[PDB]
């Protein structure tokens, strides 16, 4: 009735093999007593890096050890623990005189790869899923607090991006806006994991267009639309000149984090957003350098 190779055909197994399990690691591993071992056949110290596995040699088999009850915690090295710390990710200028952002409004493309500290941290992993708490610290360039009313509006990709301080999009009938005086404590808001993918992707090795991929378009290599969350717009709430030069610092703090596929830490300086370019001529070593391997 069947053909056997069809009854066996393990094609369609949705479950992943595994091989490894997750164990409780509340504290560091304890050290149990060790004694001299003079025997042939058992060689812990001998390993083979070629295999591709880290040496599994225990302190106990390398020296006579005492007993130590390690109660040191590992809580501070969790992801939420490590990543859930507010950091600067965006900065916006609203000067009186200038060419940057006059007219009293600004459209900041929501991209957290513009500030080296925060960027390097996350670029530790390839994928990352999480909610976040955005805080907005506004004031004048002197750090002086001023009685001015702003309006921050999150504009999802597709929504009409404001073209002027008095644009119609500021009616914000469905977009979520926040009205704040620069004298009120920094506005703070909770943001869900909004993406069509299951996790944000710091690195996307490929294109999104699907076309020819000529020279003029290599601009899109590495551009993954599942991270383009839209823009953040801000404007002084009025009809006339703001009267004061403003600056908004955007701080993001992740929470409910899930990270996957750890990769090498950024070695060189950063040059552009969403683009791992590096200075070809100024390729500095990862660390410090000595004069000889035989001296400190």
């Amino acid at each position: 009735d069947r053909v056997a190779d069809v009854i066996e055909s393990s094609i369609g197994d949705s479950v992943s093999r595994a091989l490894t399990q997750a164990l409780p690691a509340p504290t560091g591993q304890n050290t149990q007593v060790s004694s001299h071992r003079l025997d042939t056949g058992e060689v812990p110290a001998l390993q083979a890096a070629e295999i591709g596995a880290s040496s599994n040699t225990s302190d106990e088999s390398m020296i006579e050890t005492r007993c130590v009850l390690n109660s040191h915690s590992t809580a501070e090295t969790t992801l939420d623990s490590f990543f859930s710390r507010a950091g600067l990710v965006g900065e916006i200028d609203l000067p009186l005189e200038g060419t940057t952002n006059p007219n009293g409004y600004a459209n900041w493309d929501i991209d957290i790869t513009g500030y080296a500290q925060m960027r390097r941290k996350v670029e530790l992993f390839t994928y990352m899923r999480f909610d976040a708490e955005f805080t907005f610290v506004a004031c004048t360039p002197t750090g002086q607090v001023v009685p001015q009313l702003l309006q921050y509006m999150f504009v999802p990709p597709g929504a009409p991006k404001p073209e002027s301080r008095e644009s119609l999009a500021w009616q914000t009938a469905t977009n979520p806006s926040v009205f704040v005086k620069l004298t009120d404590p920094p506005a703070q808001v909770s943001v869900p994991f909004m993406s069509p993918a299951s996790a944000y992707q710091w690195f996307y090795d490929g294109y999104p267009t699907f076309g020819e991929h000529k020279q003029e378009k290599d601009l899109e290599y590495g551009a993954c639309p599942n991270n383009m969350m839209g823009t953040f717009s801000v404007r002084n709430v009025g009809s006339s000149k703001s009267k004061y030069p403003l600056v908004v610092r955007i701080y993001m703090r992740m929470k409910h984090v899930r990270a996957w596929i750890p990769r090498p830490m950024r070695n060189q300086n950063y040059l552009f957003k969403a683009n791992p370019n590096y200075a070809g001529n100024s390729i500095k070593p990862t660390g410090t350098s000595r004069t000889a391997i035989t001296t400190l």
């Binding site: 949705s14 992943s16 996307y204 090795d205 290599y221 596929i261 390729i283």
Partner: protein
């Protein structure tokens, strides 16, 4: 019973008498897409044996001065074989891999290659040297297919990241005094159940000489390195006409 091994998939069988065990990427065997993980509502194609097999794609020559090479993956196998076809006709693709890099020499030769799997391996440019120019790596460099590409600044994996740390990735070494081949088994890894085999490359295969090849003169100097990969649990959906890119 650990240095010798045989890998058999489809109608292909690889033999090795000096291998150093098998690495299973992130400790997970390649699986098919779950019913609750998928979204594409059309019933996919699972060619099985016609595409899940060992394609021996390329050979490089290791020289006392070689810098290293890489191959982007989803892609490398396109245009070649029935796999290639299903990857061009279908929009959506999904699959794990069994990568077997081989390279032998004599007991009188010496050297050591690092063989890693770097997921989402985005390439970067030298930025015009000074760093003022916002250049971008060309299609010929980001998606070299077979033949791979040679690294220009291996120390930073042409992407500003230390190769010294590349081992946090499924890797294996080919130390000539110890073995003559590496074997990594990577599962499908992406933030999506399926994606276009064409314009997205799930990971790159790195093969870099960390300890330079060397041998007294007179010993055969042609030391090749051959890549042989095999898709596993290949699934395709979203059938249309055939597409090259």
């Amino acid at each position: 019973s650990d240095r010798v091994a045989q890998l058999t998939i489809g109608n292909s069988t690889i033999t090795t008498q000096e291998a150093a065990n098998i690495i299973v990427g992130y400790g997970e065997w390649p699986s098919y897409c779950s019913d609750d993980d998928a979204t594409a509502v059309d019933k996919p194609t699972r060619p099985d044996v016609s595409v899940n097999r060992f394609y021996t794609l390329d050979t490089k020559l290791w020289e006392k001065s070689s810098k290293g090479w890489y191959w982007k993956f989803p892609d490398v196998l396109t245009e070649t074989g029935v796999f290639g076809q299903n990857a061009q006709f279908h929009y959506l693709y999904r699959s794990g891999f069994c990568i077997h890099v081989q390279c032998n020499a004599s007991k009188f030769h010496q050297g050591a290659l690092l063989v890693a799997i770097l997921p989402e391996y985005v390439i970067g440019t030298v930025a015009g040297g000074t760093g003022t120019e916002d250049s971008h790596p060309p299609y010929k460099q980001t998606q070299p297919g077979a033949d791979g590409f040679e690294l220009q600044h291996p120390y930073v994996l042409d992407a500003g990241i230390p190769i010294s740390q590349l081992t946090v990735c499924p890797h294996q070494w080919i130390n000539l005094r110890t073995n003559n081949c590496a074997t990594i088994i990577v599962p499908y890894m992406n933030t999506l159940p399926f994606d276009s085999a064409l314009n997205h490359c799930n990971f790159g295969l790195l093969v870099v000489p960390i300890s330079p090849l060397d041998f007294d003169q007179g010993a055969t100097p042609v030391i090749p390195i051959t890549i042989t990969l095999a898709p596993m649990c290949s699934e395709f959906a979203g059938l249309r006409q055939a597409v090259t890119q």
